[PDB]
């Protein structure tokens, strides 16, 4: 029942109002699922679980290609039923900004497939403009040194 | 008149240096520039040069000389680039910025080649810094932009932060500079790209928020147009929205104008997540915004 | 007479009279205002000047009649110079407005 009250009526405030600087509220979210049952975890987590895989990948820095994929494919579905619920929708955009940012920060694997991955997780108004902008400058810089 | 014109020995080491300074102090900076174009000395005549200039090539001379510094660049293994730079510094100092500007363009051409020739990073920064100053002085702001941008292996980004801060934060510079930059963005906006890179965008974006301090429309309008041209329009509306809120000393007629623009920009987006602007951390709907203009 | 500045002024004066309802408005924008004057940039606007333009569209133009919309569309198809959907025409106007506006402030 309590799954339904954060996902179907008011998106987490520990992923919307959380300060991005030190992420102190975001890891309260994480720690209070360590106070909630883990002896019977895989029977009540399906909205809460998306939160769990998200939090381990970003907070604790568990950047594995497989982990990244698992979250993205799941998060497409998840986005597809609460991109129209109030609050929840605004939080999804935060999540997406964080995951995209996190991949450069650990070394971008720079394969076709992970380029793909970036666009398969939803993008904002400045982001789609930036990518096209930067790719021509980057080419220019290469041809710069004699 | 009496020495260096009846006794010009053509492509001789001695009479080339003597002439080249003598014209320079007589204020003919064009004719001096012509002389280095009759031989780039580090290669043409190598680094062997007279005993009294040798003193200058080192730091074994303790008098007056600014040309001292020009001899110093015959010791360095980046000798072509360093030489021309020194000529740039020399012209700028005697107030003949046109000819300095010529010299550092060659100096920069030389530095890019000399990246397979060992050339110090600390050297590079100072050399490129010297180029930006000349362009800024005549206000040829288009070229300032190219040199920084493609020159990220030439400078550190922080020295770059300072340069853009200097022209953004100084009012003498700000209108003329901003106009040259934003024109170039608009040309490229059309094409599907951005004229700037994403790294450049954030440095600027930061520099423009320092201005904001107590709201103020002008501060807001500069950051607003900045957002508008990088196709960050949704975020452009958030900046507008703050002018409304942050000041309660605005007229009803001032408020109504801002709301209309915020309402219109979101309503031209037709998505499910670009139908709102963020106020702090609070989601403010397109419906709530329209009601706010209706409440006026 | 290539007195494009004043040409705009007379057309605006005529439109401000509230006796036009929504179809003696559909006709004017596709014949004159949008193709000649707002597709070409040559005018410096600002936040307020753009706002006021926002006021005119939102209050008095758009088709409420189903027959009016379908008719505007057939006419658009036959003589193309304006976006075919009119909710894509909302978008296209705003963009040209924003160009004029940007150019004053740069």
Which one-letter DSSP state was computed for residue C23? Answer: S
Tell me how far apart the alpha carbons of residues B244 and C14 are, in angstroms, rounded to a whole number: 33
Cα(B101)–Cα(C30) distance, rounded to whole angstroms? 52
Question: Residue B189: exposed, middle, or buried by beta-carbon count in 10 A (0-12, 13-18, 19+)?
Answer: buried
State how far the Cα of A62 lies from the Cα of B213, in Å rounded to an integer: 40
| Distance between CA atoms of residues A74 and A80, nearest Å | 10
Contact B230 A90 (CB under 8 A): no
Give residue A124's region: left, alpha or beta (phi > 0; psi -120 to 50).
Answer: beta
3-class secondary-structure state, position C41: coil
Q: Cβ separation of C106 and B178 shorter than 8 Å?
A: yes
Q: What angle do CA C59, C62, C63 make, to 5 degrees?
A: 130
Residue B174 in contact with residue B168, Cβ under 8 Å?
yes
Nearest Cα to Cα of residue B137 among B105, B104, B97: B97
Structure tokens at C57: 């569209």
Residue pointed to by tokens 């204020």: B27
Nearest to residue B264, comparing CAs of B234, B243, B242?
B234
- Cβ burial B206-234 (10 Å sphere, 16+ → b, else e): ebbeeebeebeeebbbbbbbbbbbbbbbb
Chain A residues with CB under 8 Å of B160 CB are: none
Contact criterion met (CB < 8 Å) for B198 and A135: no
Radius of gyration of chain B (CA): 27
Task: Quote the radius of gyration of chain C (alpha carbons, Å).
Answer: 14
Under a CB-based contact definition with an 8 Å cutoff, are residues B133 and B147 in contact? no
Please name the member of A93, A133, A141 whose beta carbon is closest to the beta carbon of B194: A133
Structural resolution in Å: 8.1
Are A125 and B197 a contacting pair at CB < 8 A?
A: no
> From CA B98, how far away is CA B29, in angstroms rounded?
9
C106 to chain B, minimum CA–CA distance in Å?
4
Residue B268 to residue C91, Cβ atoms within 8 A: yes
User: Which of B175, B201, B176, B177 has its CA nearest to residue B188?
Assistant: B201
CA distance B41 to B83: 9
DSSP symbols for A33-91? SSSS-SSSGGGT-SSHHHHHHHHHHHTTT---HHHHHHHHHHHHHHHTTSSSSTTHHHH
CA-CA-CA-CA dihedral for B193, B199, B205, B208, to nearest 10 = -120
CA distance B190 to chain C (A): 11
- Give how far Cα A1 sits from Cα of A4, A6, A28, A45, A85, Å: 5, 10, 21, 11, 17
Distance CA B265, CA B274 (A): 10
Do the beta carbons of residue C31 and residue C72 sit within 8 Å?
A: no
Two structure tokens written together for B179: 């106009």
The torsion angles phi and psi of A6, rounded to 5 degrees, stand at: -105, -20
Token code pair at residue C52: 């006021």
Evaluate whether A65 touches A59 at the Cβ level (below 8 Å).
Answer: no
For residue B281, give how far its alpha carbon lies from the nearest alpha carbon of chain A (Å). Answer: 5
Q: What does the alpha-carbon distance between residue C98 and residue C89 come to, in Å, rounded to a whole number?
A: 14
Q: What is the DSSP string of A87-99?
A: THHHHHHHHHHHH
CA distances to A8, C58, C62, C70 from C66, rounded to whole Å, are 38, 18, 11, 6
Tokens of C1: 């007479």
Determine the Cα–Cα distance for residues C81 and C68; give it in Å rounded to an integer: 19
Residue positions counted in chain B? 296
Give the DSSP letter of residue A17: S
Percent helix, percent strand, percent coil in chain C, to nearest 5: 65, 0, 35
The position carrying tokens 């003598």 is B22
| Kind plus residue range of the DSSP H or E element containing C5 | helix C4-15
- Determine the number of helices (DSSP H) and then strands (DSSP E) in chain C: 5, 0
Q: Chain A contacts of B276, Cβ < 8 Å?
A: 90
Question: How close is the nearest chain A Cα to the Cα of B108, in Å?
Answer: 10
Deposited experimental method: cryo-EM
Q: Which of B224, B130, B135 is nearest to B176 (CA)?
A: B135
Rounded to an integer, what distance in angstroms lies between the CA atom of residue B252 and that of residue B241? 14
Which residues, other chains included, contact B123 with Cβ-Cβ below 8 Å and sequence gap of 6+?
B76, B78, B81, B82
Q: Please measure the distance between the N-terminal and C-terminal CA atoms of chain C and give it in whole angstroms.
A: 31
Nearest to B205 by CA among B191, B189, B184, B225: B225
* Residue closest to B102 by CA, chosen among B32, B163, B39: B32
The single residue listed with the structure tokens 């200039």 is B53
Q: How far apart are CA B237 and CA B262, in angstroms?
A: 5
Neighbors of chain C by Cβ distance (3+ pairs < 8 Å) = B
**What DSSP string runs through chain B?**
--STTTS--TT-HHHHHHHHHHHHHTT-HHHHHHHHTT--HHHHS-S---HHHHHHHTT---SS-SSHHHHGGGTSTTHHHHHHHHHHHHHHHTT-HHHHHHHHHHHHHHHHHTTSS---HHHHHHHHHHHHHHHHHHT-HHHHHHHHHS-SSSS-HHHHHHHHHHHHH-HHHHHHHHHHHHHHHHHHHTTTS-SS-HHHHHHHHHHHHTT-SS--HHHHHHHHHHHHHTT-HHHHHHHHHHHHHH-SSS-HHHHHHHHHHHHHHHHS--SSSSSEEEETTEEEEHHHHHHHHH--
- Report the C-alpha gap between B286 and B237 in whole angstroms: 12
Test A125 with B278 for CB contact under 8 angstroms: no
């Amino acid at each position: 029942l309590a799954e339904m009250a954060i996902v179907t009526s008011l998106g987490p405030r520990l992923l919307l109002s959380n300060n991005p600087v030190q992420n102190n509220e975001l890891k309260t979210l994480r720690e209070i699922l360590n106070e909630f049952p883990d002896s019977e975890r895989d029977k009540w987590s399906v909205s809460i679980n998306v939160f769990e895989v998200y939090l381990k990948l970003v907070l604790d820095n568990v950047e594995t290609q497989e982990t990244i994929d698992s979250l993205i494919s799941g998060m497409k579905i998840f986005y597809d039923q609460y991109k129209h619920c109030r609050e929840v929708a605004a939080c999804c955009n935060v999540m997406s900004q964080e995951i995209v940012s996190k991949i450069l920060e650990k070394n971008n694997p720079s394969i076709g497939d992970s380029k793909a991955k970036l666009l398969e997780l939803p993008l904002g108004q400045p982001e789609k403009a930036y990518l096209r902008g930067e790719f021509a400058q980057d080419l220019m810089k290469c041809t710069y040194k004699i | 008149e009496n020495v260096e014109c009846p006794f010009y020995l053509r492509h001789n080491e001695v009479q080339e240096f003597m002439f080249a300074m003598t014209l320079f102090s007589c204020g003919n900076f064009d004719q001096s520039y012509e002389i280095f174009q009759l031989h780039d000395y580090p290669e043409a005549i190598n680094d062997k040069l007279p005993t009294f200039l040798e003193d200058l090539k080192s730091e074994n001379y303790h008098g007056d000389s600014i040309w001292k510094d020009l001899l110093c660049t015959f010791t360095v293994p980046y000798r072509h680039s360093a030489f021309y730079y020194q000529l740039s510094l020399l012209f700028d100092r005697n107030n003949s910025q046109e000819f300095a500007l010529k010299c550092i363009s060659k100096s920069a051409e030389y530095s890019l080649k000399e990246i397979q020739i060992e050339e110090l990073q600390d050297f590079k920064e100072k050399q490129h810094i010297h180029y930006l100053n000349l362009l800024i002085h005549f206000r040829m702001f288009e070229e300032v932009l190219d040199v920084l941008r493609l020159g990220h292996e030439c400078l550190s980004d922080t020295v770059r932060t300072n340069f853009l801060q200097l022209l953004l934060q100084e009012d003498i510079y700000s209108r003329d500079f901003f106009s040259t930059l934003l024109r170039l963005c608009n040309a490229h906006s059309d094409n599907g790209e951005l004229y700037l890179r994403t790294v450049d965008i954030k440095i600027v974006d930061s520099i423009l928020s320092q201005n904001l301090r107590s709201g103020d429309w002008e501060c807001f309008k500069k950051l607003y147009c900045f957002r508008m041209l990088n196709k960050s329009e949704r975020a452009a509306a958030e900046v507008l929205y703050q002018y409304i809120l942050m000041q309660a000393d605005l007229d009803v007629i001032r408020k109504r104008k801002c709301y209309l623009m915020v309402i219109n920009v979101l309503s031209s987006f037709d998505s499910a997540y670009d139908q709102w602007i963020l106020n702090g951390s609070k989601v403010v709907t397109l419906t709530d915004l329209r009601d706010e203009l209706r409440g006026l | 007479r290539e007195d494009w500045g004043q040409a705009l002024r007379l057309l605006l004066l005529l439109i401000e009279f509230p006796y036009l309802p929504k179809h003696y408005l559909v006709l004017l924008v596709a014949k004159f205002l949008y193709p000649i004057f707002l597709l070409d940039d040559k005018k410096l606007m600002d936040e307020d000047s753009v706002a006021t333009v926002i006021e005119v569209i939102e209050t008095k133009w758009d088709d409420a009649d189903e027959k009016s919309s379908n008719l505007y569309e057939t006419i658009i198809e036959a003589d193309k110079s304006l976006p075919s959907s009119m909710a894509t025409l909302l978008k296209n106007l705003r963009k040209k407005l924003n160009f004029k506006l940007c150019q004053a402030f740069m």
